[PDB]
Structure formats: C-alpha cells, structure tokens
Amino acid sequence: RMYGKGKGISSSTLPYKRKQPSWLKQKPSEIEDAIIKLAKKGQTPSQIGATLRDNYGIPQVKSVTGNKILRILRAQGIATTIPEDLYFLIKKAVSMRKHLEKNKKDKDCKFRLILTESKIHRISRYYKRKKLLPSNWKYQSSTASALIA
Amino acid sequence: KNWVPVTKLGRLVKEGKIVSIEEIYLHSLPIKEYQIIDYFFQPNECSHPLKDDVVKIMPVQKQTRAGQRTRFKAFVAIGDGNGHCGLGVKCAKEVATAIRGAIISAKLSLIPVRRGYWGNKIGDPHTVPMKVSGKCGSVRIRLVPAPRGTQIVGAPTTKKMLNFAGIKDCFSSSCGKTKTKGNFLRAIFNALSKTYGYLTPDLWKVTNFDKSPYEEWSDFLETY
Amino acid sequence: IYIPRKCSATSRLIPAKEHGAVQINVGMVDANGVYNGKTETFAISGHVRQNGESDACLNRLMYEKKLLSFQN
Amino acid sequence: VRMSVLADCLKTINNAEKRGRRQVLIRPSSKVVIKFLQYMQKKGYIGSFEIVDDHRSGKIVVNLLGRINKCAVISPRYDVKLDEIEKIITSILPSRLFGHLILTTPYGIMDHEEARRKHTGGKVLGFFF
Amino acid sequence: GSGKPSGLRAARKLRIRRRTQRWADKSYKKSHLGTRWKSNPFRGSSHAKGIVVEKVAIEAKQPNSAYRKCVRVQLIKNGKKITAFVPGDGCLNFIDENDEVLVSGFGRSGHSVGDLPGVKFKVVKVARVSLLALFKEKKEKPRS
Amino acid sequence: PKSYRNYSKTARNPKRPFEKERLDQELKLIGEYGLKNKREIWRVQYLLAKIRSAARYLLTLDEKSSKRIFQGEALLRRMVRQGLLGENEEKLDYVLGLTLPKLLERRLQTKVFKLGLAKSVHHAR
RNA sequence: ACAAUGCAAGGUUUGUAUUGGAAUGGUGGGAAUUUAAAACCUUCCCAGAGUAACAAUUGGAGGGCAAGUCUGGUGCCAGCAGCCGCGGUAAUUCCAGCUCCAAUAGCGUAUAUUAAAAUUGUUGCAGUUAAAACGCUCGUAGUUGAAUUUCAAAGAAUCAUUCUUUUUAAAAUCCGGAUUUGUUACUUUGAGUA
RNA sequence: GCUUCCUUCAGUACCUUAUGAGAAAUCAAAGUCUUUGGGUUCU
Lengths: 149, 224, 72, 129, 144, 125
Ligand SMILES: [Mg+2]
Ligand SMILES: [Mg+2]
Ligand SMILES: [Mg+2]
Ligand SMILES: [Mg+2]
Ligand SMILES: [Mg+2]
Ligand SMILES: [Mg+2]
Ligand SMILES: [Mg+2]
Ligand SMILES: [Mg+2]
Ligand SMILES: [Mg+2]
Ligand SMILES: [Mg+2]
Ligand SMILES: [Mg+2]
Ligand SMILES: [Mg+2]
Ligand SMILES: [Mg+2]
Ligand SMILES: [Mg+2]
Ligand SMILES: [Mg+2]
Fold this sequence. Notes:
Bound molecules: magnesium ion
Distance between the termini of chain E: 73 Å
Largest sheet of chain F: none
Oligomer: part of a larger assembly
Shape of chain E: elongated
Strand order of the largest sheet of chain E: 3-2-1-4-5
C-alpha cells in the first residue's frame, strides 16, 4: 500500500478466456447504449462497470465490446473533465478540510489530509503528464471544493 | 607394526583387502584408528611419506580456585605433499603428549584435496581447481588458482599447509583475524576439503557406483 | 584420481568426510519373490537426510526404477 | 518493488538448487530471462522448462539437474568493452576453465567466450558456475 | 540491499559520500587538514635545529621507573619550545646548556614514544657532531 | 637540462625479510651456483619474473590473437636462445615452468664449472 | 682461488688447521688511444699481495623476526624498548667482551607517501548486542523502475558441440528479378593524435 | 441464523529445526555474503 503499512492483496483477477463466453447474448451496440444511459444517470466508470456486472448479464465490457468503458464514454463524449480516482481523492480532501475547519484539534485527520493531498499531487501530476488534466491545474485547498462538480 | 584392530574397516585394512585410501574416501567411511593411515603411508612400499609439523603450541589456562591450570593446545598439519592433507588439534597437560595426540587427530582428519589447473592442462596438476573458500570463526580464506611458476602467494602458515596438501601454486586471501592461527588453519582445511565437493563440468557424468568394503568383503568379516 | 560419489537423488556429489550420506542397497526379486543375486543401489547425500526429504527422494528413485509404485 | 525480474528469478533458482528441489517456479517470465535460461540449458546446467503463458507476465517452471553451484545477476549492467572483459571474468567466476559470464551484446545474449570469439563486448547480465 | 546505491547513473552519490566520509579516517585527516603546518613544531619537516634552553629530567610512565633525560630546546626555524629526549647511556652531559642541537622525530610521527610522557623528539646532533658518534666515542669527540 | 639516459632497477627486495624457509632456499642457491649476495638471486628472480608475467599476460589472450602469436612467439624464441627450453618444451605454457635453477644454469660461471675449466664454482668465478 | 699433508665428520668423499706454488685486480709510473686540450674509459709494457695490515661495514641476537636463557659489570639506577616489554643482585632486553644472524659497499635513523588498509570498501567493509538505522511519516531533486512489439525455421562442414549459407512478413526504390526502413546511450571497427 | 472443523487471505506472536547465518549471545531474519552486485535513503 502506497501510504499505510497495509500489505493486503485483495483483488479482482480476470479469467483466462478473454473472448466473451458463449452464454453472453447481448450485442455490443445494446451494451454501449446501456453504458451511456448509466453514465447519464450520474454513475462513474467503476460504478457503471459494477452495475453492468450485477444488474445486466455481462462480466467485462472489454470482452463484449473491443473497447474499455472509459474509452467508450470518451467516444460518446460524456467523459468527465476530471478523472474518476482523482475526483474521488479531491472529494475526500475537501471533506477532510471541512472537518479541520470545524474541528481544529484533530491531529490524525490533519496527518491523513496531508497524505491525501500528496496522493492527489502524484495522481494530478500523472494526469498532467498525459493530457487528461490541463497543465494549468494545481489543485488548491481554497478552490478544491468548487472543482469536484 | 602389529595392532589388534577394533573397527571393521581397520580389520579389513590389516590384511590386503583394500587397495588405496582412495577407496575408503570414496565410500565416506569413518576412519577411527590412525594405524590405518600409517599403514597406507609407510616409508617402504608407498611413494610419498606423511611429513608432519607442529605449526603452533598455544598454552591455554583454566584458572581454578588454586591458581592457573595450563594445558597446551598443539596444532599439527600432516601431509603427503601430494593429494592428502590433515589438520589435528589436541589439548593436553604436557607438550609432547599434546603433540602426539594432535598427530593422531591429524591422521584421522586426513582428506584428499583435488589439485587442478590454471588455463589449460599440461603435465600434472598443481594449483587448486577453482577458487575455494573456507571459513572458520572470523577468518575466511579464498585460495585462488594460479599459473605454474607462481609459488604459494600467501601467509607463512598458509604456505606450510598448502605444501603439505600438495598444492604448489596459489593465491591466498584472508578476511578476518589470521593472527588466531588455529582458526586460520581450520579455514584452510575447510577450503581444501571443498575442492572435491565442488561439481565442475568435468563431473556431470553419472558413473555407476563402486561396491563398499562392507558388502564386497562381508564374507571375510564373518570369520573373525 | 578418486572420482567422488554423486548423490543419486540431488546430484550434489559427496566428499570423504561427509559420513551421514549413505549408500542404501536394495535387493532384487526373481519371479517367486526369493532374493535374486543382484542389487540396485542409491547413494543419498547427508543434506537430504538432515532435511528429512531423504525418504521422499528414495521413493522417487524407486518410482524411476520399478522397485516401488506410488511416487508422491 | 520488482526492478530486475531477472535477478529475482536467478536468486530463486539458486535457492532451489541449494535446497535440492527439481522443479522451481520462476514467477515473472521475461524475454531476457527466457534467453538466459536457454543459454544455461545449452551449456547443460538446466533441464527443460515450461514457460506457462497466463494472460499476463508468464510464469516459468524450470527443471533442474542438480548441477548449478551458483547462478547470479551482476546488477549495474556495466557496459563492458572487449578488452575489459578478462579482468571482470577473473574477478567473478571461479576458474578460467569453467563457469560462464553472460553478456547482453548487440548480437544477442551470449557468454564471455562467445563474445571474445565474435569481437563485441556489451552489457554484463550475470553468471553461473 | 547493500547500503550503497548501485545504480548505473549513481556515481555522484557514490563519490560524494566517499568525499565526506574520508574525513572520518584519522590518518587521512592528519594528512589533509591545514592545521598540520600551523600546529607542529617542525612545520612539516624531518628535523629541526634548536638551541638548548634547559637540560631536564622527565619521570617515566607508572609501571616503569626512570627519569629520562630530556632537553627543552627552542627551534630556530619556528621559535617553538619542545622537549627532546636525548639517547645514550650518558649523553645528556655530552651536550652543553646552550648548544645548537639538531632534533628529529622519535619514530611515531607526532605520537609520543614508549615510557616517555609527551616528548615527541629525539636530539640527534650537537654542534654538528653526531650524538650516536659521541656515544660510540671511538668515532668522534665533541668539538668546541 | 637533465640527460635522457634512462635507468632502471634490476632487482626488487623480498617483502618479508626474515622468513626462514625462503632464506634457507636462497642460501642453498648461493651455495650451489657460487653467488655473492642475495642481490644476485633477487636480480635473477626479477629477470625470470618479468618473463613469467609476460607469459601470463599472453595466456590471458586467446590463440590467433595477433598480439599473442607475435609477442608470445618472440618471447618463446628468446627463451630458446637463452637456453631455457630447447626442443621439447616450447609452447608458452612451459615458459611459466621456469625456475631459478634453469636461469642460474646459464650464468657464465656455472657454464665454466660444467665444461671442465675449473675444479669448482667459486674457482670458475 | 687452488692443491698437498694435519684434523674433522659422512656413507672412500665433502668439510676445516699447517704449509706453497699458480691467478689477479687494486695502487704507483710510462706509453697507445681518448679529447677542442686534458682527465676518465678501455689497451699494452714496466713496477706490484700472504696476517693477500690491499685489514667490511651497518644494525641486531626475549617476542614480533634470522640470530645466545654465552662471560663479566649494573641493580626499578643508568639505560634500552617503533609495539609487548626488560632493569627491584643468574638481566637471553641495560653497559660491555666473545660468539652468532641479516643485508652487505653499503646499512641505520627521521618526516612524508604507496602498499600492507576489504582500516574509506566501484570491485569491496560495517550498522540487534562491538562505532553506526534519522522518533515517525510525507516529500523535491537524486537513484531505481513489471511484462509486452520478428519469435523462429531449414541445409553444408567439425569433434552432444563449433563456424558458415539460405528464407519468413510490409513499404519505398531499380530493369517477374534486385536493392533502403525511428533517435541517443551502449558496443565494434576505424580515422586523427609529439 | 450462530458454532465448530478444512482451506485461504492480511495481521500477529511462539515452538523445534537448520550441510543457513553469525564473533558468539542468538536470528525463519541477523538467512539466499570472499559461490561477495534486486532497488534505495541514512549512519
Ligand atoms: Mg512511499
Ligand atoms: Mg505485495
Ligand atoms: Mg647550462
Ligand atoms: Mg627467532
Ligand atoms: Mg630503535
Ligand atoms: Mg649476565
Ligand atoms: Mg649484548
Ligand atoms: Mg594506505
Ligand atoms: Mg587490496
Ligand atoms: Mg571495519
Ligand atoms: Mg552500539
Ligand atoms: Mg528506527
Ligand atoms: Mg522523486
Ligand atoms: Mg523492462
Ligand atoms: Mg558485500
């Protein structure tokens, strides 16, 4: 684990066969449409994937549709400006900051806030290095709260 | 010189049931009596005799309620000067007695050391075959094989041991306290021992086994 | 030139002062069950004996021959 | 974390040899590692090995002949010129008569002797005895 | 892990640590600090010429019991006062209370030698005649 | 300016000056071949030693490397000329196998002693 | 140096005290030459060793470390001793004499330096307790960074191996044939260096 | 539904055992180290 002393290995591990299984009836177009609908309804990539797995009969959008789900969202144009994980981190940070504002003496929270900030800065940096974030994007503790939306 | 042999191997060796000490080495047998070793290296019959030396007589004190109580550790290296080296230790009250004990110990120890070659094989092996390294206590020594004309580059004690072993040409190292002579000697011995137990591209061959003295002559031992 | 003995299991090859290491000898059968004259042989190094894998090694060796039949 | 897969693999192999295993599961296969293994096989030290393809970094399992004394990586893959080789080999491997010092060389990976024969030295991966 | 970095491009760290650490080596520090030239009577030299100021005794280290015969001399070079032990069975009297003595080290760089407490110097010539020669006596006699 | 007439030490000292065995060996050598010091022995060792070093270096190179064939060959030839090897033992692995006796044999005094002329080594000298 | 006897030891020969003829530099003087002129070098001719006075020293002999528990003197004094130590009336250590040992026309002492030093550690140190893991985490530079992209295949020579030849895709170029295809590190050949 | 037993994850101790280590005390890490180079910070 990047920050704790946590060393767990709980993980999804996908099956050997990566051409979709026989029982999968859904044609790709339908699944794409479903994905789009889910996106519209406010769900994030991971969440969307989960929904697809559970509510509909489909293991992996990658086996049914050549593309992964983020890619298809992008194609359809409903991709977030601000990437999933990063966004989540930002939200968490914001929450922490609110708590701090409320409740000044919380040392552990402060420590954890610092850690989350650091992680954001890593993630943020990575995104900048690609082209998902713009280069003009620092993350600010003052702004942050407004950013998430 | 006659002695009533106790052990089976010894008994066998008493008569001409064994060719060489090589055979006994092969089947990893525990040599108990120094008499066996003597029999294998006599001045008559045999070629190279066992030249010995008292490399160190260190005095060693126990400190009882009434003063000190000195014993003498003797170390001895024993050596064919060609294949077989041995290293004995004995702590005893008198010096001479200790020395005597140590020679017996050395004989018991006596090991075959593989001499090999540097570069390419010409007449008769001379150095160690590969870098062999023993440790005993702090002192760890790394004999490295050398070309022919080199002598034993190494400490006096190491030179002494190596001549006995029958290595002519070598390169010594020595990490650790070499002033502690006994340990150094032990390390050297260990290194020498390692020479057979190394497993070179030479020895990939799976040659079928020889029969041990104990099965090949079991019938002859039933008489006694 | 004494060529030392190769542990039949692990091939480690075993020196003079090993002891420990053993040349176990297995006697053959001739149709009836009676002791045939011949003897099939395995040297086992000291290390394996110390470990306790020796028995396993022996079993494997037997399997490789025909002497016993289960492997593990 | 991983850094040099190959080094780790070699360490594992060495450990296996020490124990006196027979089989050994080298856990992330790598082209380089495979090449190394092949080389080893060629010079007799290793038996068969069944590079098992997952759908990821593969696993190898490798069949051992009880024959390796040590095998190793020498990290910092030092560039090594053809003249500079001899000293390096003296430093490393136990005898001039045997052992092999494996270079990655612009003519694929090969041992020091091979390199000498060719003419090109290159970067030095590892070795065995 | 080793402790040290063994990267291919690591050289800067490797050099730099060594450069800093060298200074922990006592001998190296003695060689390369500038205080050598400052804080040393001979001022980086084998010998030095000093006129004598006082023939003096120095009591030895506790186990041994002697009064070692020293000569407190002033270096002409440096204006430094130093005790220099004089060898010989009876070689204090071979020198005068004011004689141009040529004094060497004792054998241990600065570090003091043997029974003597803090006398780091061995007079080895008086009025240009060799102390050793005088001691032998068959060779020479002190000119004055 | 300084002259350019460069000059060189012919003999290295021992290292360990009161090793018994070595000393005894040296003395024996002196006895046998009528030599004045240990210096002579040292000089001859040095002479031998350079050659040996060269041989070693050559052996580190492979056969049909130009240097090895040329320089090595030259060395061998020189040895032959000197009376160190002769017919049987001219292969570059052999020039390592030279010892001090081999070299001392070819000293003039030794030769003189051999080929009648004088009753002794000392006499010959 | 050599040979005689005398003496010695060894399984007749080596070794070592009397003699005594041979050898020869050195040293002295002439030349020949050398050299700008001399001087040396070498060269020849006269001179020319037996205590071959034509005289080997230097530093050591407790250990480290080769060599004395030899003789007198000193008496925790003087002194020696790089270090450990020696000296308090047997000093194997001082001061001597004798004998021995080493290196020897050299041999000591000092200061510096290299090696010894894997005691600065790239090769190559150590860090529970010996000196040494920052109280802890984050963190910039720094160093380090999973796997993945043409794998392979066949023929001839040699003593399972070595060295060689041939083809297995795509694009541009040339009259179905034939021939170019990321950058740098790295490496190989060169070139050019007093 | 809880409980046990099996296997397995992540903690986390202990016991025997080291042809493993160590100067030893001891250490499943202090092991895979003169058969010395996985990475890296500090001393
Ligand atoms: Mg981290
Ligand atoms: Mg993990
Ligand atoms: Mg001028
Ligand atoms: Mg001595
Ligand atoms: Mg002195
Ligand atoms: Mg006396
Ligand atoms: Mg005396
Ligand atoms: Mg140094
Ligand atoms: Mg060194
Ligand atoms: Mg250290
Ligand atoms: Mg501490
Ligand atoms: Mg800590
Ligand atoms: Mg960084
Ligand atoms: Mg990679
Ligand atoms: Mg290391």
